[PDB]
């Protein structure tokens, strides 16, 4: 039935910037009053910031504020902080004395632009415990870097690997606004013990960093 | 004032979910309550509203399969949804949304996974730090949490006493259809001989908890 469209769908802004997110309803909301704004941080439940278009919940910092009339609404973050990294949703109430409906906008992801930071790169051999099971996971960790885009390649005895690895990336850290990334190379025990040099190569811009180990040297 | 949820977990396709929230500290007919869901990685979706007057209204997408009720004697509100498909996998919430009133109250949400696959506990392996660091006085260590189903697993370190520098990565679906994740932490290398580091892995869907001490070498 009802729709709500937020704009933009995502944005990047600097700490201290003023941020504005527009919400836009397909009908007039109940009493032209019932619009709230919610904030959802990674792996957390949504948290209400604003209700009744402009009332600020007592648990929320005063840099959040809302405005708007009828069918168009606005959330303003007056001085963006690292911990404001989140997806923001407007929610609207609708209906008559005989109808009751709620609709959510599609969400606006707010990302924090910060200065470039090179990752610390760590490489982990498979544990002896796992090798007994017949499988070998080699993990490469890229810790606390910015920006997010990075190319991570595996090399086993200087042969480039394809199709035997998976990546996972965190969301922006709520304190330093960096990312971390893991890449996991999965081989059988038989494959793992047939080679010596395991290397993970990380490329960002004009720099590549390679971390390696020689199987069984400690 | 709380709104603890119950009734989630692994459900087979074609089956039904039944979810209930028990109001702790007030009467359920005091306020109107919504049911909301969020598929992994997606936005919030309103299922339906039970007005404090007792009339239930549903979004058009959900009217066919959904029934919301309340039991004043039970102090509970209930979502019933049938003919479940994979697209119904989501975290489900009961909440008074507070679009216009100062009161807003949310359950903690429970994941409902619609799948015919069986539950499987994780294997936990150490990601051990090297005895001598090669990263300027910082050591990385962690635990690899492999081959479990369904989600979620939670990881803490030293029973929650260690939070700074922890990264628990989002799980990845493996080609086996089982999940895997890692949780890592960076600590001062000088602490490796002194400080004990234990990852606490909880997989509530299989009623399995694993506590692993991660030692150098």
């Amino acid at each position: 039935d009802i729709q709500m469209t937020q704009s933009p769908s995502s944005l990047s802004a600097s700490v201290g910037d003023r941020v504005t997110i527009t919400c836009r309803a397909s009908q007039s909301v109940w009493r032209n009053k019932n619009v709230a704004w919610y904030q959802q941080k990674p792996g957390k439940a949504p948290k209400r910031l604003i209700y009744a278009i402009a009332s600020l919940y007592s648990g929320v910092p005063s840099r959040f504020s809302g405005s708007g009339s009828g069918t168009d609404f606005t959330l303003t973050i007056s001085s963006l902080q690292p911990e404001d990294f989140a997806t923001y949703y407007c929610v609207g109430h609708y209906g008559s004395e005989n109808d009751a409906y709620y609709a959510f906008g599609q969400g606006t992801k707010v990302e924090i632009k910060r200065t470039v930071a090179a990752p610390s790169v760590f490489i982990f051999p498979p544990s002896d415990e796992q090798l007994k099971s017949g499988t070998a996971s080699v993990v490469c960790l890229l810790n606390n870097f910015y920006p997010r885009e990075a190319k991570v390649s595996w090399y086993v005895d200087n042969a480039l690997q394809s199709g035997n690895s998976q990546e996972s990336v965190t969301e922006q850290d709520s304190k330093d606004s960096t990312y971390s990334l893991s890449s996991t190379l999965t081989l059988s025990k038989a494959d793992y013990e047939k080679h010596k040099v395991y290397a993970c190569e990380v490329t960002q811009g004009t720099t590549s960093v390679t971390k390696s180990f020689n199987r069984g040297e400690c | 004032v709380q709104l603890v949820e119950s009734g989630g977990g692994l459900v087979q396709p074609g089956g039904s979910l039944r979810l209930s929230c028990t109001a702790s500290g007030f009467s359920i007919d005091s306020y109107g309550f919504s049911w909301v869901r969020q598929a992994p990685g997606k936005g919030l979706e309103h299922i339906g509203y039970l007005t404090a007057g007792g009339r239930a209204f549903y979004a058009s997408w959900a009217k066919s399969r959904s029934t919301i009720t309340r039991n004043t004697n039970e102090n509970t509100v209930t979502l019933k949804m049938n003919s479940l498909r994979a697209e119904d996998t989501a975290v489900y919430y009961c909440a008074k949304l507070g679009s216009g009133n100062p009161v807003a109250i949310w359950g903690q949400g429970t994941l409902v996974t619609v799948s015919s696959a069986s539950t499987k506990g994780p294997s936990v392996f150490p990601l051990a730090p090297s005895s001598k660091s090669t990263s300027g006085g910082t050591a990385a260590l962690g635990c690899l949490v492999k081959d479990y189903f369904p989600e979620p697993v939670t990881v803490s370190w030293n029973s929650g006493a260690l939070t700074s520098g922890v990264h628990t990565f989002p799980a990845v679906l493996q080609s086996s259809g089982l999940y895997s994740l890692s949780s890592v932490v960076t600590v001062p290398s000088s602490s490796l001989g002194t400080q004990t580091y234990i990852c606490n892995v909880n997989h509530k869907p299989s009623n399995t908890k694993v506590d692993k001490k991660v030692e150098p070498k």
């Binding site: 109940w30 009493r31 019932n34 109430h93 609708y94 209906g95 008559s96 004395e97 005989n98 109808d99 009751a100 409906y101 | 109107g32 509203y49 007005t51 404090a52 007057g53 009339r55 209204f57 216009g100 009133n101």
Partner: peptide, 5 residues
């Protein structure tokens, strides 16, 4: 009214 319906 606080809410609709």
């Amino acid at each position: 009214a606080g809410x609709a319906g």
